[PDB]
Amino acid sequence: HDSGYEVHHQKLVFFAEDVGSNKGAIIGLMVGGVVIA
Amino acid sequence: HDSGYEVHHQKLVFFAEDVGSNKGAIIGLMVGGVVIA
Amino acid sequence: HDSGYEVHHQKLVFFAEDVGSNKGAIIGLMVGGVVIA
Amino acid sequence: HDSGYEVHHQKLVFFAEDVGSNKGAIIGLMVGGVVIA
Amino acid sequence: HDSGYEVHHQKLVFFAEDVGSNKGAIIGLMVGGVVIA
Amino acid sequence: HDSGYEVHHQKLVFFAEDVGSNKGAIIGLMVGGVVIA
């Protein structure tokens, strides 16, 4: 991310609450790789 | 992201609450990679 | 993003609340990569 | 229904295929009673 | 139903195939009674 | 149902195949009684 030299208080929040059915992908934070279906 | 040298208080919030059905992709933050369906 | 040298209080909020059906893509923040369907 | 005296070959077909979310009522054949939400 | 005296070949088909989420009522054939939510 | 005197070949089919989540009622054939949620 923001590489720099110094990073102070950082707070991330990712979620998914009420999913009935899921046949695909629910990804929070994606930086690389491959995700199929 | 904002690489720089210093990054103070940063706060991210991503979510998805009431999803009935999902057959595709629900991605919060995408920087790279491949996501199929 | 805004690389610079210093970044103070930053706050992002992304969400999707009431989705009945989803067959495509629901992306919050997109910087790179490939997303198919 | 068609009370009469005689009823020959009768064929009914009711269905619901692809429903994402449902918060109400999905009734096929209604003759009486009470259905709330 | 069709009370009468005689009823020959009768065929009913009720179904619901792909329901993601359900918070209400999915009733096939209703003749009486009470159904709440 | 069709009380009458005689009833020949009768065939009923009720089903529900792919339900992700269910918080309500999924009733096939309702003649009486009370069903809450």
Question: How far is C-alpha B5 from the geometric centre of its chain's CA atoms?
Answer: 23
Considering only CB atoms, C7 lies closest to which of B7, B15, B26, namely B7
Smallest CA–CA distance from A22 into chain F, residue = F20
CA of A1 vs chain B CAs: smallest distance (Å): 5
Q: Closest Cα partner for F24 from A15, A26, F16?
A: F16
**CA torsion sign, E22 to A22 to C27 to B28?**
positive
The β-bridge partners of E35 are D35, F35
Q: Which amino acid is at A3?
A: S
d(CA E18, CA B21): 9
Question: Which residues, including other chains, have CB under 8 Å from residue C27's CB and lie 6 or more apart?
Answer: B25, B27, B28, B30, C35
Considering only CB atoms, B25 lies closest to which of C11, C25, C32, namely C25
d(CA C9, CA C24): 33
**Which two three-digit tokens encode residue B3?**
């690489």
CA of C2 vs chain A CAs: smallest distance (Å): 10
CA atoms within 13 A on the CB side of B8: 6
Neighboring chain A residues of F21 at a CB cutoff of 8 Å:
20-21
Mutate to test the interface with D, among F30, F31, F34, F36 (most CBs of D within 10 A): F30
**Residue F25: how many CB atoms within 10 A of its CB?**
20
Contact at 8 Å (CB) between F31 and E33? yes
**Method for structure elucidation:** cryo-EM
Cα radius of gyration (chain A): 15
d(CA D37, CA E35): 9
Q: What angle do CA D36, E2, E8 make, to 5 degrees?
A: 125
Contact at 8 Å (CB) between A16 and B26? yes
d(CA A35, CA D3): 59
**Which two three-digit tokens encode residue F21?**
């989540």
Q: What angle do CA F25, E26, C25 make, to 5 degrees?
A: 105
**Which two three-digit tokens encode residue E21?**
């989420």
Question: Which residues, including other chains, have CB under 8 Å from residue C28's CB and lie 6 or more apart?
Answer: B14, B27, B28, B29, C14, C15
Rounded alpha-carbon distances, angstroms, from residue C35 to A18, A26, B21, C26, F21: 23, 12, 19, 10, 27
| B20/D contact by beta carbon, under 8 A | yes
Contact at 8 Å (CB) between D21 and C21? yes
Contact at 8 Å (CB) between E12 and E29? yes
| Residue that the structure tokens 């495509």 belong to | C24
Contact at 8 Å (CB) between F16 and E15? yes
Contact at 8 Å (CB) between F20 and D20? no
Q: What is the DSSP string of chain C?
A: ---SSEE--EEEEEEEEEEEEESSEEEEEE-SSEEE-
Q: Which amino acid is at E31?
A: V
Helices assigned H by DSSP within chain D = none
Task: Report the b/e string of A2-32 with b at 16+ CB within 10 A.
Answer: bebeebeeeeeebebeebbbbebbbbbbbee
Give me the resolution in angstroms, 1 decimal.
3.1
d(CA C25, CA B27): 8
Edge-to-edge strand ranges of the sheet holding E34-36 = D34-36, E34-36, F34-36
